Amino acid sequence: LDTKVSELSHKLGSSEGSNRSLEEETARLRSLNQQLSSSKHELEIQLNEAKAKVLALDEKAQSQGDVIEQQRGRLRDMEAALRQTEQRCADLRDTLASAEGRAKEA
Amino acid sequence: YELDTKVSELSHKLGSSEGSNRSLEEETARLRSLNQQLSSSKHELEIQLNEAKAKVLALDEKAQSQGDVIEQQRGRLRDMEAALRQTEQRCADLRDTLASAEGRAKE
Amino acid sequence: ELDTKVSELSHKLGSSEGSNRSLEEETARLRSLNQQLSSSKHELEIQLNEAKAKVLALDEKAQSQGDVIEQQRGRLRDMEAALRQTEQRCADLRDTLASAEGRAKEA
Amino acid sequence: REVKYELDTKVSELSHKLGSSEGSNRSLEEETARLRSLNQQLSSSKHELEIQLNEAKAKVLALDEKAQSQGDVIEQQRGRLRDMEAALRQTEQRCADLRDTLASAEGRAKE
């Protein structure tokens, strides 16, 4: 019975020593988990803000691109209208000079 | 009898200690697993944030350049509207002089 | 013999008890996690319903705005046309007037 | 055999205490497994709602952004329509004035 008491005390000591270490580790892990869970929540807030800014910038860039192309088209049409109006001027000048020449003959 | 009660007391206390150990080992494994899942979500969100922040800078840069083009086209459009208004006015004056000479030639 | 059975039972009892306290410990944390998850779920449900509602209202507004834009574009082209034609009538009256002025001058 | 009765009672007492403990353990394991299941279901719903919410929130921002840009176009077009109405009103008025001046010149030329 004396040998049994010794064997059990011995097994209990080993088990309890292991237990105190495991209780420390559970406490350590619960703490790290709380910290990671907080960082995760924080990164989610920051990501949502950054993703929001991307969408706003995407819409601005797409709208700006449309404006540029609309203005490009309008500039082309204006260049054409100006070239044609100046050409009508030049033609009127020549027709006037020709009518003056016709009239001179008398 | 007093020695028999000690063995029974130690056996019971050993069983309780072992049961606590079996449980603590399971909980440590449960917590370690959760920790690497949380650690992975954190690392993932960091990658995604860095990419989103990068995309914002690229879009800010593009939006600023596009904004410059828009205003330099607006300025050019204004100058073209002006040139056209003035040229059309010179045309209209030439048309009046030509129409007048046509009328004089007719009579 | 019977004393070894007593030792065997006491050890098994302690282990069973220890396991039981571990489950009591577990149930409690599970009840807590459940309450937290249930609350996040309720919150997300509210937010989703609101966001889905806002999507419908924005889709409706975007579609109506698109109609206006196209109606205005159609009206702009009809006004451009009317202006082009009216200016052409002007130019023709301006030529007729300049012609009459020239005819009067020679007489 | 008086000691055997005292030892026999212990075995009996401990056996019944073990069975009862073993039984309580099976009930507690059912509650842990009932709660673990509900937790998994709730955790899954949460993850699902987060995906859906992120998508819906994204769509809201894109639509808000589009509606603001469309509103700018509408107002730019309204301004341009007003300027065109004015140009047209003025051109038609110049026409009417040229018609009157022409009719006058025709009348003077006749006399």
Numbering used by the authors:
A (entry chain F): 9 to 114
B (entry chain E): 7 to 113
C (entry chain A): 8 to 114
D (entry chain D): 3 to 113
Paper quotes:
Centrioles have proximal-distal polarity and a 9-fold radial symmetry imparted by a likewise symmetrical central scaffold, the cartwheel. The spindle assembly abnormal protein 6 (SAS-6) self-assembles into 9-fold radially symmetric ring-shaped oligomers that stack via an unknown mechanism to form the cartwheel. SAS-6 proteins comprise a globular “head” domain at their N-terminus followed by a long coiled coil that mediates stable protein homo-dimerization (Keller et al., 2014), and a disordered C-terminal extension. The characteristic shape of the SAS-6 ring led to the proposal that the protein head domains comprise the central “hub” of the centriolar cartwheel, with SAS-6 coiled coils forming the cartwheel “spokes” (Cottee et al., 2015; Kitagawa et al., 2011; van Breugel et al., 2011; van Breugel et al., 2014; Yoshiba et al., 2019).
In contrast, structures of the CrSAS-6_CCMiddle fragment, resolved from two different crystal forms, revealed parallel complexes featuring extensive interaction interfaces between coiled-coil domains, within each crystal’s asymmetric unit. CrSAS-6_CCMiddle form II, resolved to 2.43 Å using one copy of the CrSAS-6_CCMiddle coiled coil from form I as molecular replacement model, featured four copies of the coiled-coil domain per asymmetric unit. Of these, two copies were arranged in a symmetric-interacting fashion identical to the form I complex. In striking contrast, the remaining two CrSAS-6 coiled-coil copies formed a parallel but distinctly asymmetric complex driven by hydrogen-bonding and ionic interactions, which buried ∼1,700 Å2 of solvent-accessible surface. The symmetry break was caused by an ∼8-Å shift between the two coiled-coil copies, resulting from a 5-Å translation along the coiled-coil length and a 35° relative rotation. The contact interface of the asymmetric CrSAS-6 coiled-coil complex overlapped to a great extent with that of the symmetric complex, but also involved additional amino acid residues; a comparison of amino acids at the two interfaces is shown in Figure S2B. Hydrophobic contacts were limited to packing of the H294 side chain against G297′ and G301ʹ (prime denotes amino acids of the second coiled-coil copy in the complex), which form part of a GxxxG motif known for mediating interactions between α-helices (Kleiger et al., 2002), and sidechain interactions between A340-A336ʹ and V351 with the aliphatic part of S347ʹ. Specifically, we substituted residues V351E/D361N (CrSAS-6_CCVD), thereby abrogating a mild hydrophobic (V351-S347′) and an ionic (R367-D361′) contact of the asymmetric interface. Although CrSAS-6VD did form cartwheels, they were less abundant and less apparent compared with those formed by the WT protein, suggesting reduced stacking propensity.
